[PDB]
Symmetry: C3
Subunit: 634 residues, 3 copies
């Protein structure tokens, strides 16, 4: 075969895992929504793409969400000019769909499982409580003069009120712009100025893993160069003394105590913007209302097989798109229970995830590879019952197949489906992932595209589509889907040039990908991280997966630097486990073993020329820093 899976130590013939009995109608668990096999997924999927799929999408939009005004047109527009429209004549409100309509049905049902940094301080927040808090904040924002279409910055740690602040903006038609609680003032400042907001929502302090985040202190520093901000609403998270500027700053609880506990919903057009989410000038990705909300609702229901009594535990941060979609909007739209985890996976112990799972009988767990490195690395003594789990998800970057099996074995007792979810901030919702009740998985593969996603592979050297299977190139989408980002805030040109110009006719994700002989999709990393050695273009995922097969390796990152005899050369930056003895295995001897590992697993063309990690707050490895340093640019 031309297309190889990510290097793994397990035979390929033993790496095809069918839906287990928990994802079958047995053991008293809900029968899957889609199942039991690959053909059942394809049968439904073919209704969601092609020239006769408007029928399916209209029904799903009318069944999934509540509308104030029906829509007439299902879809229009396209990539070339970026005029994407879905359900354009309809009106709705995101807070009505995430709060009110469930409050009216079961007001005492739990909406948020607030897992505080300290396990003792945790509690359940009901749809009644969350709605009242949202409506109070919404009334406060209106009293500040916030109007439909105004931007509101949010700088909140993972306390449950963060959901109320997001939904308060959506309730009144404001455009919330979340900034990870922990970015520098320079990062907070740039995002506040770009969106031109006049109101900022934040806390006095945060708490994560026992540490103290000086959110208010950072804000005051950033706001010295954010001229337009006139109002700041400070949640009293800790109560510890923080500076409160007179007039500009007010306490959340004092402001809310003056306001009523209900607020009307602003009737929003489908294409009114719901939020701006900046990405690390800053790129403010803009999502509209109806299509984004429907995408998050549909993906949560099918990719995680969500059922009414489920308790969904996404361990990400609301400052990132994974929090937007699968902590707040997705789960609350489906009306289930969602987790807001304010701690780290290592506090009080590396068993918090598992203590959390057993304490709350969580039905799905959704975290990232960068955190997955933690648990499997430190010890499986930390891994409990975990029987409540039924679907396990991973998001953020390629998952080395080695981490994949531990996830299947110890967290799932070989009884959970593992869903590797591929998507971007700009897709809004999950693009390629297995439906747990239908798809037999492979370690390290995203598998098949989700409803509405018609993806293909393009040879970047010819610009043409590679027909068939067992092909490799760059991933592109053929048609718009409802949750696609609609622009980059006040910079539509950057939007078109980045995603719509590189391969005209298609959307360009920016990732290398391959479709193997079985049709399974494999995402191998950024195209900008590809290294071309003597005509062999190498992905960062395959070299880094082969390295992690050597004893003692924890995490790696390979970058390319120019080479006069091979064009570029692979340079690998390697991190070792703490117990590993660097004296027994000399650094020169370690590199020799690693280069032989890569040569054996990939080929001589891939052997690193030199072996020696800078990571953003989102958990991503800053490979652009490793590349420039190797060249000698400070």
């Amino acid at each position: 075969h031309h297309v190889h899976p990510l290097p793994d130590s397990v035979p390929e013939s033993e790496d095809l895992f069918a839906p287990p009995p928990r994802m079958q109608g047995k053991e008293g668990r809900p029968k899957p929504h889609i199942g039991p096999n690959y053909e059942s997924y394809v049968k439904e999927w073919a209704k969601t793409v092609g020239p006769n799929s408007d029928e399916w999408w209209a029904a799903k939009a009318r069944e999934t969400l509540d509308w104030y005004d029906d829509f007439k047109t299902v879809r229009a527009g396209g990539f070339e000019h970026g005029d994407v429209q879905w359900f354009p004549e309809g009106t709705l409100n995101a807070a009505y769909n995430c709060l009110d309509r469930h409050y009216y049905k079961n007001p005492k049902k739990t909406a948020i499982i607030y897992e505080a940094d300290e396990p003792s301080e945790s509690r359940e927040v009901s749809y009644e409580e969350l709605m009242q808090e949202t409506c109070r904040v919404a009334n406060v924002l209106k009293s500040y003069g916030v109007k439909k279409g105004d931007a509101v910055s949010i700088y909140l740690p993972m306390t449950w009120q963060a959901a109320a602040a997001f939904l308060a903006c959506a309730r009144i038609g404001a455009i919330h712009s979340a900034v990870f609680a922990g970015f520098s003032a320079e990062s907070l400042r740039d995002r506040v100025n770009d969106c031109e907001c006049k109101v900022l929502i934040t806390t006095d302090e945060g708490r994560r893993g026992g540490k103290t985040i000086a959110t208010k202190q950072i804000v005051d520093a950033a706001l010295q160069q954010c001229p337009l901000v006139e109002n700041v609403l400070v949640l009293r998270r800790t109560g510890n003394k923080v500076p409160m500027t007179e007039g500009r700053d007010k306490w959340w609880d004092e402001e809310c105590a003056k306001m009523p506990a209900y607020c009307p919903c602003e009737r929003m057009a489908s294409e009114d913007p719901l939020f701006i989410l900046y990405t690390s000038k800053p790129k403010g990705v803009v999502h509209s209302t109806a299509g984004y909300l429907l995408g998050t609702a549909l993906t949560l229901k099918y990719v995680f097989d969500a059922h009414p009594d489920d308790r969904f535990a996404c361990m990400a941060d609301i400052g990132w798109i994974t929090g937007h979609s699968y902590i707040i909007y997705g789960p609350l739209a489906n009306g289930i229970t969602t987790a807001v985890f304010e701690s780290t996976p290592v506090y009080p112990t590396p068993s918090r995830y598992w203590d959390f799972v057993d304490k709350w009988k969580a039905t799905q767990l959704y975290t990232a590879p960068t955190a997955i490195r933690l648990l499997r690395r430190m010890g499986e003594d930390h891994v409990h019952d975990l029987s409540s789990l039924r679907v396990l998800g991973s998001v953020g970057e390629p998952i080395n197949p080695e981490a994949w099996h531990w996830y299947n074995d110890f967290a799932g007792k070989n009884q959970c489906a593992i869903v590797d979810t591929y998507w971007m901030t700009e897709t809004g919702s999950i693009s390629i992932a297995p439906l747990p009740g239908a798809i037999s998985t492979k370690p390290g593969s995203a598998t098949f595209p989700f409803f509405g996603m018609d993806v293909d592979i393009i040879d970047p050297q010819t610009g043409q589509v590679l027909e068939g299977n067992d092909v490799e190139g760059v991933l592109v989408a053929r048609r718009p889907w409802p949750s696609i980002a609609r622009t980059v805030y006040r910079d539509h040109k950057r939007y078109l040039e980045t995603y719509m110009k590189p391969y005209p006719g298609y959307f360009f994700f920016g990732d290398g990908a391959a479709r193997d002989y079985d049709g399974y999709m494999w995402i191998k990393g950024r195209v900008d991280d590809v290294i071309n050695v003597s005509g062999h273009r190498l992905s960062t995922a395959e070299v880094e997966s082969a390295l992690i097969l050597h004893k003692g390796v924890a995490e790696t990152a390979v970058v390319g630097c120019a080479d006069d005899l091979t064009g570029q050369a692979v340079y690998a930056f390697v991190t070792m486990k703490p117990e590993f003895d660097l004296k027994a295995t000399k650094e020169a001897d370690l590199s020799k073993e690693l280069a032989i590992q890569v040569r054996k697993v990939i080929g001589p063309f891939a052997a690193p020329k030199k072996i020696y990690l800078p990571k953003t707050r989102s958990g991503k490895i800053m490979r652009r820093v490793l590349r420039k340093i190797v060249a000698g640019e400070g």
Copy 2:
């Protein structure tokens, strides 16, 4: 029985009055909506409360009002957090329901009977004229930058244009805040700043009882300490010279002449706030009671239709002032929503003479009259010569609101205003309830002097023992009044002071709404509201209402009005002190002042008991704007402290 009715001079067996023939469909009058007996009231009422009342309320909401968008949910929320919701997904506009839809049906039907202070200046205002005036003001407010949800203060006397100012704000989604024309600048200023409005609507002057109110003069004084006000719209009521600040102030007639006579309606969510009505209440600051749109509007429409048995051609004569909740609900919103004729009375009941009410009724053939006990007592003091020589046959329902009505005043009302041929409706409610809470349905309920009787549709009230916090099951019980579940017209908050809203009405008896009134349900199930809990007097363990001691006093020949307050007493805890006003004709020389007092105390001792007999009686000329007697002032005077500051000194002298 343990529960006694308010003192009356008629035997209890002879003091139950069944709907007269005018409310039996006879004499050419329209058949009542509910009737003909108590059972017909209960049959409908039981559809309006309980866990299966959503069906009735959904239907009445869709039958009574015109909606731009239908609603899905009927009710949600509750007392505990103050998140009451009614018809939340629906949209409508109050001005469309009060003007446009009736204009489109019968544009020339009369909307307002404008009874000016001078009777010669009175005229009829049709729905077309009022709609056009409303739309001109709305355009004027919008030209000023007024947006949906902004507060607009109104300081207007009782001229018909006051309705156009209220409905102009409602038409564009502004929040109107009315201030009684006659409050001091100090009271106006507090209300203008609290609601944070930028636009004020007022007159150059007012006219009441022959006097001239210098509204603009008061306004200018108030606005020197109102930094947020940017625009003032001055109706040209008198034409006498007033100071007009350049730019800030503009003439109503000049501004409106520039605008079109139509304006689109703002589509409002049911729960968007419709108005703020401040009350000089509780203490310290003014309490801005906030009502939302759909539930308030539906509450006033339904109460007017059933409590006053309103039919399409009726001519409803509420003699209250639009600066108070009775004016909001039963001059403007209630009647105009029902599409009938409503009266705007610019005079007093004694100007030019005490026959004004009755001249008005016959002049316009009014079909229902709605006034207060303070005016019934006032007229009753001036003589039956001014009321005896009138027809008054057009009337068929007479209403009383504001406080408990003494059975003596009740009988004067029934005898001379209704000629024993009208139904008397005693309406109990508050600013905070939005609409009538407890009252008799005139075609169905047999009344008792001084009793409101039974709760209105949607009101499920109870009596609570304030010392046990428990509901007193059964009849012949006494305590404080409470409501069990929200109703559609309940106030939704206190403007920017939700804590004051929860603390005042929702915390004192958790699970309930606390009216603040003592109440009792007699053996027949009739409810009796006898006065504020803060006004109770306790003599040797006997908790006394001010209404029952004052009802017993007024049974003595010559008594016009009384006021009793409690004073501390070392041997009985408190003691009753009574302040008495007599009729003009009564001779103080024939019956010495001391001998009169003894007869009064013996009256109370006989009817209530010696513990209620006043220890001392002060004969005054008058008692100390809403028509309420300032008993808190008389209480402080008898203790030793220190609308008209002259009576206050007059009291201090006799005391």
Copy 3:
């Protein structure tokens, strides 16, 4: 040739015109209102109000948007159809603009205006020549509920200063220069002169029609193409009430038109007076600065979903044949031109209906033979800014017409003539007097901006309960009108 909608004799035009007036006048206007336009919300009341107090209302409860009805709905049905034929001043610079392209430009501009804080109900002034982006400007203002005030591109800086200050607009849309009859119309120069005394105007959007160097006030002035490059190509439509104002057109008498009425009147007149059909190519040579360009270049044609022409030249540039080179080059199917234009000195078989807007009666024969070849129709049209849509015209495939007259007044308008000395209408035929109208029509102007007083003292108070046109008119034994 497609069959005309109304025909073939008068009894077909009496059975129809009898429905647009009278007691059941409502039932007909209600059907047409629902059939012609797309509504976001239905309407309950057909008509209310009258001339007396100036409270005219049509379809008050309904909501809608002019851009959705002139762009989106046709885009969704056939996006590549040509909405505009842009006949540049230089004939070889002409090109077709599709509904898609026209929609995307409108949405961009609409997004720009929103970034400047323009809100529903705000005023925006438009100082543009007859380039095709003028319709995108009009419709971008309508798309967001903003009130556009079109000021003809030839007006002086003084006349623009006055029109911009009356409407109180905070945003102005102009070009850097114009082009007409081979000449250059310095519009930004005139814009900078006037604005020195326009204290409310805070943002100006300048379209590069020539690229020539012009002054740009930093901060206030921004380039159209640079501002629009930052915005998405879709914008939501504001849900407007029928009686929300759509535009101000000063004659400083700023005539105001509501939305659903003016739009219904414009759509119906094109579909009948000119007998427009789906594939027709309506050519109107007016300017978007006047009510002729508003109603029969932009709103009427783009509402019916046909093709309309934006003619940027004169009738004699390059040569007096331009109309007829125009007509054959694009196969125009209707022609609409002024009185001004057989004195300075082609196939044309595609023309089917020909109209003007008084013309000497010999021009009626010349316009029927040299332009029609005794195979075309001829429709004469009189009206004014305050009427919203053409008032007096004959229906083409039904009514046998005569030179100089107009057979019958348009659907839903019933006029008469008053004796200016007795103030009594002269019933009957063979009469003369001052022209006035009876009852309300949908497209009637609703006020004069912030001078409803003048609105009454000019058209309502002069003759009680009537609309006073201000021009003398006469009727003859044939039931025909003369201005």
